[PDB]
Amino acid sequence: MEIKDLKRLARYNPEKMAKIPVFQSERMLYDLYALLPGQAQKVHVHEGSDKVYYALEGEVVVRVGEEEALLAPGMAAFAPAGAPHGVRNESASPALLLVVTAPRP
Amino acid sequence: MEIKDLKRLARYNPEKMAKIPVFQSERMLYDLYALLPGQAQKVHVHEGSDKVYYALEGEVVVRVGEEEALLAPGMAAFAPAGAPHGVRNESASPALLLVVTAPRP
Numbered sequence: 633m634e635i636k637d638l639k640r641l642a643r644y645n646p647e648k649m650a651k652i653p654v655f656q657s658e659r660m661l662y663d664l665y666a667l668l669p670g671q672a673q674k675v676h677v678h679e680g681s682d683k684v685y686y687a688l689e690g691e692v693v694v695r696v697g698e699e700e701a702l703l704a705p706g707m708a709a710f711a712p713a714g715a716p717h718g719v720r721n722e723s724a725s726p727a728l729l730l731v732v733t734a735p736r737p
Numbered sequence: 738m739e740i741k742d743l744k745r746l747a748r749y750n751p752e753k754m755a756k757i758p759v760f761q762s763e764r765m766l767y768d769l770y771a772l773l774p775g776q777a778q779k780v781h782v783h784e785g786s787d788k789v790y791y792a793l794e795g796e797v798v799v800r801v802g803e804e805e806a807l808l809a810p811g812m813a814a815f816a817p818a819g820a821p822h823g824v825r826n827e828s829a830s831p832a833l834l835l836v837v838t839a840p841r842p
C-alpha cells in the first residue's frame with residue numbers, strides 16, 4: 633500500500649522552497665512543503681480548494697485571510713477556499729509542513 | 738484563521754474509537770482518530786473518497802485493500818476511494834491519527 637514516512641521524504645532546496653508530493657490522489661494534494669529559512673509559499677487565494685497546513689517540523693508563519701500565526705509543530709491551520717493564505721519560514725531552521733489541499737486543484 | 742494544536746484535541750472514548758473533527762471543511766474531513774488499545778475504525782469503504790491516515794502518536798495496524806501495515810508515528814497511509822480500509826490499535830498504548838478524507842463522504 634502507499635505508506636510513507638513523511639519526514640524522510642522532505643528535501644530542502646537552497647534556491648527555493650520545495651513541494652514534495654507524498655501521495656498521488658485524484659481527490660486531494662497531500663504534500664510536504666519543505667521551507668528553508670527565508671523561503672515561503674507566497675500568499676495567494678485558491679477559490680477552488682481548501683488547504684490545511686500542518687507543521688511536521690520547525691515553524692512557519694502561516695497566513696490565512698488577514699491574519700498570521702506561528703504554525704509550530706503539531707499545529708494545523710485551515711485555509712478554506714477563497715481565503716488568501718501562505719506560509720513563510722522566518723525562522724533560522726528548516727520547516728516541514730504536511731499540506732493537504734482538497735479537492736485536487 | 739482556524740488554527741489548532743492537534744494533540745490537544747485528543748479525547749478518548751472507552752467504549753469505542755473517538756472521532757474528533759479538527760476542521761469543518763466542505764471539501765474534506767480532517768479528523769483526529771483517538772484510539773485506545775483494542776479500538777479501531779471498523780473496515781469501511783468510501784466509494785468516492787480518498788482517505789489518508791497519518792500517525793501523530795502511537796501506532797495502528799492500517800488496512801488498505803489487501804494489505805495491512807504498521808502505521809507508526811510520522812507515517813501516513815493512503816486509502817484510495819473504493820479500497821476497504823480501517824485502522825486497529827493493537828498496541829497497549831493510545832494512538833492518535835490525523836485522518837483526511839476527501840471529498841467528504
Ligand SMILES: [Cl-]
Nearest residue numbers: 653655656657
Ligand atoms: Cl500529484
Ligand code: NA
Nearest residue numbers: 781782783784
Ligand atoms: Na461505506
